[PDB]
């Protein structure tokens, strides 16, 4: 089997992407944030504290003839940005772009943190990291991909995120029309539960490529590109007036600037992030200070190839017995 679904930016900055997901019988369609940096499929629901729901579409398990309470199971998750959610668990039928999994753990939120409430466009998350990170207790649950894998034509999914435009998540096949040139595959460590890999270096603008190993994660659920402070300083030094602002929380730059591109290595291949992808606009409405899309990972404890990087590529998440990641230009 295969599946194919369009993923759409939630706003004009590509802060996140939402993908429609069918849950239950009859189908209830919720718009979920596909997150290769976590492993829980959780939703706003009829069980979510009412004051914490503000515009989201909710899953109502009592209206699904295929929903079953997973007795005794609870979940609780905290994300790198300080947001969180928790609740109980149902199993139900879940379909993405025509690909159906029966008995998928659907984690129903009883509580969500303010950042989730405040984002009316995101009805929940669909985790696509390794199932070892799943938070359900006392019986850990599998991701949608893990459950689908054996049925897929090939044990892969691909992320093709758009810049200020829709893109695509495919399951079970590689669309050879969706990228240019060849796909370069690189090794993955699953030791921390992430799609963790090592970039071979970087360049800033038309500058020379610096060969240096950068361990990090391919994370569709993180907006920005978080890299070592040395790398990030080298980038922003090429933008007149750019500076790190402790008050704002990262590098800012004059909105009048033209940003250089940023290249990252994948083996001997190179992915070029155009400068415009690195612009996250005014820090506050009407400001002439703009927020940068490349930020330091210092104090995160891990480098993160988030949407800024991934949307410059066609990305293969290969869930074969030995997982790998592939990147192509597009």
Swiss-Prot record:
Disulfide bonds join 255-290. It comes from the Eukaryota. GO terms for molecular function: aspartic-type endopeptidase activity. Its EC number is 3.4.23.22. The keyword Protease applies. GO terms for biological process: proteolysis. Keywords: Aspartyl protease, Disulfide bond, Hydrolase, Protease, Signal, Zymogen. It is an enzyme of class 3 (hydrolase). Residues 17-328 form the Peptidase A1 domain. The active site is at residues 35, 199. Belongs to the peptidase A1 family. This is Endothiapepsin. It comes from Cryphonectria parasitica (Chestnut blight fungus). The gene is EAPA.
């Amino acid at each position: 089997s295969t599946g194919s679904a369009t993923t759409t930016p939630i706003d004009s900055l590509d802060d996140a992407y939402i993908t429609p997901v069918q849950i239950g019988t009859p189908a209830q369609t919720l718009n979920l944030d596909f997150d290769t940096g976590s492993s829980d499929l959780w939703v706003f629901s009829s069980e979510t504290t009412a004051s914490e729901v503000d515009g989201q579409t909710i899953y109502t398990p009592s209206k699904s003839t295929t929903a079953k309470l997973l007795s005794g199971a609870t979940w609780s998750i905290s994300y790198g940005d300080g947001s969180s959610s928790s609740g109980d668990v149902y199993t139900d039928t879940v379909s993405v772009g025509g690909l159906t999994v029966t008995g998928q753990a659907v984690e129903s939120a009883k509580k969500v943190s303010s950042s989730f409430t405040e984002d009316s466009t995101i009805d929940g998350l669909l985790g696509l990291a390794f199932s070892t990170l799943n938070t359900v207790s006392p019986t850990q649950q599998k991701t949608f991909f893990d459950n689908a894998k054996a049925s897929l034509d090939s044990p892969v999914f691909t992320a093709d995120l758009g810049y200020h435009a829709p893109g695509t998540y495919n399951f079970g096949f590689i669309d050879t029309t969706a990228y240019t040139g060849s796909i370069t595959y690189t090794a993955v460590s699953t030791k921390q539960g992430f799609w963790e890999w090592t970039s071979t270096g970087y360049a800033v603008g038309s500058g020379t490529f610096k060969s240096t190993s950068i361990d990090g994660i391919a994370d569709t659920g993180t907006t920005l590109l978080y890299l070592p402070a040395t790398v990030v300083s080298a980038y922003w030094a090429q933008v007149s007036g750019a500076k790190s602002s402790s008050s704002v929380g990262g590098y800012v730059f004059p909105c009048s600037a033209t940003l250089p591109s940023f290249t990252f290595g994948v083996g001997s291949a190179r992915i070029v992030i155009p400068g415009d992808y690195i612009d996250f606009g005014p820090i506050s409405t009407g400001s002439s200070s703009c927020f940068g899309g490349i930020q330091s990972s210092a104090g995160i404890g891990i480098n993160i190839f988030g949407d800024v990087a991934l949307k410059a590529a066609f990305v293969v998440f290969n869930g074969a017995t030995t997982p790998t990641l592939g990147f192509a230009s597009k």
